[PDB]
Design a protein around this motif. Structure first.
Motif, PDB file in Angstrom:
ATOM      1  N   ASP A 109      61.763  56.474  40.358  1.00  0.00           N
ATOM      2  CA  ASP A 109      62.193  57.828  40.671  1.00  0.00           C
ATOM      3  C   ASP A 109      62.513  57.941  42.166  1.00  0.00           C
ATOM      4  OD1 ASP A 109      61.860  60.927  39.396  1.00  0.00           O
ATOM      5  OD2 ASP A 109      61.834  60.708  41.578  1.00  0.00           O
ATOM      6  N   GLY A 148      60.348  58.014  36.043  1.00  0.00           N
ATOM      7  CA  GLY A 148      61.161  56.810  36.148  1.00  0.00           C
ATOM      8  C   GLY A 148      60.397  55.681  36.836  1.00  0.00           C
ATOM      9  N   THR A 149      59.417  56.060  37.644  1.00  0.00           N
ATOM     10  CA  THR A 149      58.540  55.118  38.330  1.00  0.00           C
ATOM     11  C   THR A 149      57.452  54.618  37.367  1.00  0.00           C
ATOM     12  OG1 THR A 149      58.901  56.346  40.377  1.00  0.00           O
ATOM     13  CG2 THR A 149      56.985  54.844  40.289  1.00  0.00           C
ATOM     14  N   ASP A 170      60.187  59.716  44.373  1.00  0.00           N
ATOM     15  CA  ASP A 170      58.994  58.891  44.508  1.00  0.00           C
ATOM     16  C   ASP A 170      59.177  57.867  45.628  1.00  0.00           C
ATOM     17  OD1 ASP A 170      57.986  58.702  40.994  1.00  0.00           O
ATOM     18  OD2 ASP A 170      57.659  60.232  42.531  1.00  0.00           O
ATOM     19  N   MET A 212      53.379  58.917  41.835  1.00  0.00           N
ATOM     20  CA  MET A 212      54.752  58.484  41.535  1.00  0.00           C
ATOM     21  C   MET A 212      55.225  58.732  40.085  1.00  0.00           C
ATOM     22  SD  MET A 212      55.644  57.270  44.752  1.00  0.00           S
ATOM     23  CE  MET A 212      55.193  59.178  44.911  1.00  0.00           C
ATOM     24  N   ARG A 213      56.263  59.564  39.959  1.00  0.00           N
ATOM     25  CA  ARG A 213      56.758  60.182  38.721  1.00  0.00           C
ATOM     26  C   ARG A 213      57.264  59.248  37.607  1.00  0.00           C
ATOM     27  NH1 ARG A 213      58.141  62.626  43.656  1.00  0.00           N
ATOM     28  NH2 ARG A 213      58.483  64.889  43.797  1.00  0.00           N
ATOM     29  N   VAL A 215      58.611  51.472  35.599  1.00  0.00           N
ATOM     30  CA  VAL A 215      58.659  50.236  36.363  1.00  0.00           C
ATOM     31  C   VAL A 215      57.268  49.729  36.710  1.00  0.00           C
ATOM     32  CG1 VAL A 215      59.495  49.104  38.481  1.00  0.00           C
ATOM     33  CG2 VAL A 215      60.968  50.684  37.173  1.00  0.00           C
ATOM     34  N   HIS A 216      56.393  50.636  37.146  1.00  0.00           N
ATOM     35  CA  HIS A 216      55.082  50.238  37.645  1.00  0.00           C
ATOM     36  C   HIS A 216      53.951  50.556  36.686  1.00  0.00           C
ATOM     37  CE1 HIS A 216      56.755  49.273  41.660  1.00  0.00           C
ATOM     38  NE2 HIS A 216      57.636  50.188  41.296  1.00  0.00           N
TER      39      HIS A 216
END
Ligand SMILES: [Cl-]
Ligand SMILES: [Cl-]
Ligand SMILES: [Cl-]
Ligand SMILES: [Cl-]
Ligand SMILES: [Cl-]
Ligand SMILES: [Cl-]
Ligand SMILES: [Cl-]
Lengths: 378, 379, 376, 376
Positions: free
Chosen positions: D362, C4-5, D365, C1-2, C8-9
């Motif tokens: 994303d 921008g992810t 994602d 998961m890229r 968050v994570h």
């Protein structure tokens, strides 16, 4: 004009024109508008912060002193003070100061700083250490830990200033409630506010408290440049614990006296160390300089391996730091003094069965009973 | 085991595998994932929060009780208990209880709940008011403010439980350091934790401490549905201050006694109200039911207008609220009880010249000196 | 998961038991040993799970194995500088950030050699990395307030052939616009106080890097110097981070709008912005920056600078940068009132140079504020 | 003035002394009155400047003269309902939030009538206000979990014909998307816990409205029942508010991408989304708000919902919504769980209906996680 302990509640409170808040509001802003400001002096958070200043004013007031400066931690306060020692200058101290403190000797050693260790629990080895060429600083931590020995601040300070050198006392152990280094003649009091002052084991902090205005400028210039500045929220937390500092400290003291007598009666306890005992080799100095004996106790465990004893506590927490509301126990040999070697520690006279207690504010008889079962085993 | 002066430190302090935090972490998350626990119990912050729950165990632990529930405010705790009085049912109380309660009482009256005020210091006046038909709840606040009269909880509860009525004691004033309503035979202790429990004048909270499991369910369902829950950071601040509740209260009480002596000595002080005085109108009840006599003091000031007295304090902060770390002075005719009715005041006791002190933890001699030189003004 | 992810994570380091989505705030200064199996949480200056989650998040943003956070950007810089010994050379630029140069000064006053250089031409870079005993090359790009841009890859390749560590102060750009490690640097340096925390309510610093022995030295210094951020401080930076990419691109898009009205204004002369075509280093900006940032500077022709500052009603007159509230300042009065007026004229910093730090306000409102303030 | 500047600066202060850009956090419960000229501050539960700042900001987002914040959404809702007198009726959307129906059952218990209506037909909106002594008309839109929509302006038109009050629970869309007051309603209700605060780390509620006498009663109620939020909580909500617009813009754009992904999966049946042509109030959608939202629901066709839920490795398995972390839930098994078997299916809720709440990660994602989940 008012008195300590009132100082703990209102000392450098503030007043809060605008609304009348009794507890000052928490200034988190990193940035400031310079047009509102009828007289500009808040620029940017690293340099200037209202909440941080209030904590500083409070701390300075506890010692009747003009200046304080708070830091991200106790180690950062020390690192700042030490930074001012120049190459070809010399920091007289002792082979028994805090391990973090000794690390700041280590690092200093590489910037042309000569670290002369000698003994300061006597007159004798005071004068020689003081006659050291190029000596700039004298570094006292009193009482020491875990052996709870002491150093006569006033006498060391008399003989040091004779050479125009600076004297710092690491006063973390006793807190301003019990010991007033600046009053005793020292030039600086250093605190890890992580302990007693904040007092709830939920924030890291340091402070320097002092009077020299030249020193004040050098210290603030360093903090701003090195950026070892505490957060506003964490200044709030340290400030919060302060109100109850003397109430906590004397509760801690009273319980310590209790446990020392419990300890002196155990068949599986050897030596008991406590600055306030009539046998203490420096009882005249403790009585002359400390208002009460402190929250720390040490003793030689005789009933077997320290590691097993540590687990038996069902009220004391095992762990490091001190002065927090929760009582703690540790074996310096296994923990705090792990990095030194045995013969090192042995030179220090720190046996592997030396146990250290930091006394919190729980019921005394609750702490006494947890200690006794632990010693007794089964 | 543990005594009270230990439960303050360790109540609600179960460790935390993996990491070993002495101080439990602050659980801010409103949100939970199923698969991280092994059965489903954390669904949503309004219903469930470890930090809130930790504070609750601590509070319950201070009264050796099964349950506690904390709230957005003392008022919220009060509203919740009051919500369990159904239309047609009668609450017996006093005309001198905290207004916030009576304001709340007014709210109840418009839903069909009927409200009855009563002096609860006399066998008859207790035995009569406790003959109020359909009695469901006896609301005891002791000491009463600002006059510090006192009600016998054991006795009043040894007659309410005959009428089939639940008894609550607003124990905010005394705190569980000094008075133990559940031990005295009450069913519920109500607290504004905003006062001495949080104790640093920097957070609001309420609490209800009780034993009935049937009550526990009803109490949680209301808090859940009404949504009057405290936040995590606030529970953290309440929990933090409570560590020093015992040390604070006893200092506060110690100074109150000194101030009371200073007050008694002054030629411009009339009546002095304090539960510890050999001639307090309920000394035996105070004797038998609290462990020390509290840290609020009230007195009639004879030296001139009350306003002029208030300005002359240099250490005492003038403000309402009580029991925090900073000593506070107020004049009920100007500060708290202000909006009343000048004929009525004489019935309830609240005089023009009545001044109320909430004692903090500054030096007793500093506070005494401030007080003595407010009393000396005459410009 | 890229990527921008990642915000968050990134390091959203779990909650065994209770299932908390947002990790709880670890404020305990200390840890019961017994409460963990193989005890590795001892004392807060050394160990803290909240701080670790932030570091793990930050390192994630550059696909780096390590990160360390600090009480401030200055503290991050001071930590990295502490690894340079007296007599050794730190090569850098005259127009580095004034906090950094104070740190150079401290270090210079310890005997470390600080060499300032032009780092924008081939001649200038050889005339930098040739110094004997070169242990550290210090790049701030873009540089503030004239918005020049140093070729990170090219400088990194040359510095490495003499065995010199390269750091990029990537505070201006953020890791959403520029990735110093991918470009060849050894260390990304940050004041998270700026756009990273993003809300102008917490001071913080960070270093992001890939060498494990560098890692050990950085942590040993932070433990001993004690320049550690607070638990609650770290929570605020972490919380800020979530929206970093969203905010950054809003700020860049508004920056672009403001650039045109500036270049259209008759009371504005020169305008600086890395993304203009006539920017002398335009190829480098393209190659190394996904967007040209949200800082804008310009020559103001229309009255004394102090009066211009007094006419804004949306932009605030103050310092720091990268936050949600737009800021304006005048270097000759505010970043550099304390300069020789001499050294001002040749840093290219005019007495009427104005710097904008673009927030996330509506671009229409900011353009209107600027326009009426310019009073053209 | 436009709709993102107010997010940053609405309710934001100078500090007539220090100049704080971000206003300081007022934690005090008590106020040394003696200073304050003509007295404003007396006690925390009644007054607190931080809380007031959040209120000015929220009111500004709908240019309403008034806003009041609460400990939680339920508390905001509870307050508004207390003003309905015994023997009166509330008309409401029958797939309103359960917490509201929970409060509805309170008023069902406390004398009031709770009467739901098909709020989507004229041939039944009129026969909903037909209720005797109509106090409140309670709209929530879009609704849960089928995302049906109610025409706020039209329902308001006829509700006002009876002199009643109209509230819209507007949590779902946020003020970025939908403006109940502009639409003709009297009150906007929010659970600020969700997208307003935005980071899943604080609870809160708000009422936004315009009438001074509602204002007095709402404030009198809050002060008395004491459902007041803390100062720090108000700080978190206000801090999260800065980015509400950027976040909502983001979540919507990703929701649309997810909808396309869903429509193509052979294990997906009906898809519910306010921005599809197939949605039965898609026309009203277009009328009364600007972008069709961040919630998407669909019938999973691969058997039990737990089969699907268990396969996500980015989406978080749980409740709330509107936050930065994407969440998946199953209404028949969670938010809407405890409804038995002879029910639920009237709310059109099947046992493999799935609800997504889209965060800011994303998009490709999130799109990829949904894919493996659907295609185990
Ligand atoms: Cl003494
Ligand atoms: Cl009414
Ligand atoms: Cl009962
Ligand atoms: Cl390296
Ligand atoms: Cl400046
Ligand atoms: Cl209305
Ligand atoms: Cl629209």
């Amino acid at each position: 004009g008012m008195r300590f302990g009132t100082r703990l509640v209102h000392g450098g409170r503030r007043p809060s024109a605008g609304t009348g808040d009794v507890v000052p509001p928490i200034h988190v802003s990193t940035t400031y508008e310079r047009r509102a400001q009828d007289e500009p002096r808040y620029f940017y958070g690293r340099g200037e912060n209202p909440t941080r200043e209030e904590l500083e004013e409070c701390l300075a007031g506890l010692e009747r002193a003009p200046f304080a400066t708070v830091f991200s931690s106790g180690q950062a306060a020390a690192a700042t003070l030490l930074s001012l020692v120049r190459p070809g200058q010399c920091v007289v101290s002792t082979d028994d100061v805090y391990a973090g403190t000794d690390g700041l000797f280590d690092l200093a050693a590489r910037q042309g700083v000569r670290v002369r260790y000698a003994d300061l629990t006597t007159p004798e080895g005071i004068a020689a250490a003081l006659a050291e060429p190029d000596l700039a600083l004298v570094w006292i931590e009193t009482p020491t830990n875990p052996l709870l020995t002491v150093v006569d601040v006033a006498e060391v300070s008399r003989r040091a200033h004779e050479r125009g050198a600076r004297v710092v006392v690491d006063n973390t152990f006793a807190s301003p409630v019990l010991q007033q280094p600046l009053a005793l003649g020292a030039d600086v009091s250093l605190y890890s506010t992580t302990k007693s002052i904040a007092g709830h084991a939920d924030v890291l902090g340091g402070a320097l408290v002092y009077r020299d205005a030249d020193l004040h400028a050098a210290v603030r210039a360093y903090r701003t440049t090195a950026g070892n500045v505490p957060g506003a929220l964490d200044c709030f937390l340290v400030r919060r614990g302060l109100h109850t500092l003397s109430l906590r400290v004397h509760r801690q003291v009273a319980t310590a006296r209790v446990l020392v007598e419990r300890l002196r009666a155990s068949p599986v306890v050897g030596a008991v160390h406590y600055p306030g005992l009539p046998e203490h080799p420096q009882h005249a100095v403790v009585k002359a300089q400390m208002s009460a004996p402190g929250a720390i106790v040490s003793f030689d465990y005789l009933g077997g391996p320290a590691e097993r004893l540590l687990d038996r506590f069902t009220l004391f927490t095992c762990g490091v730091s001190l002065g927090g509301v929760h009582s703690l126990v540790e074996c310096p040999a296994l923990m705090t003094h792990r990095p030194l070697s045995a013969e090192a520690r042995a030179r220090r006279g720190i046996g592997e069965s030396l146990i250290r207690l930091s006394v919190g504010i729980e019921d005394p008889q609750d702490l006494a009973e947890d200690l006794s079962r632990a010693l007794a085993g089964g």
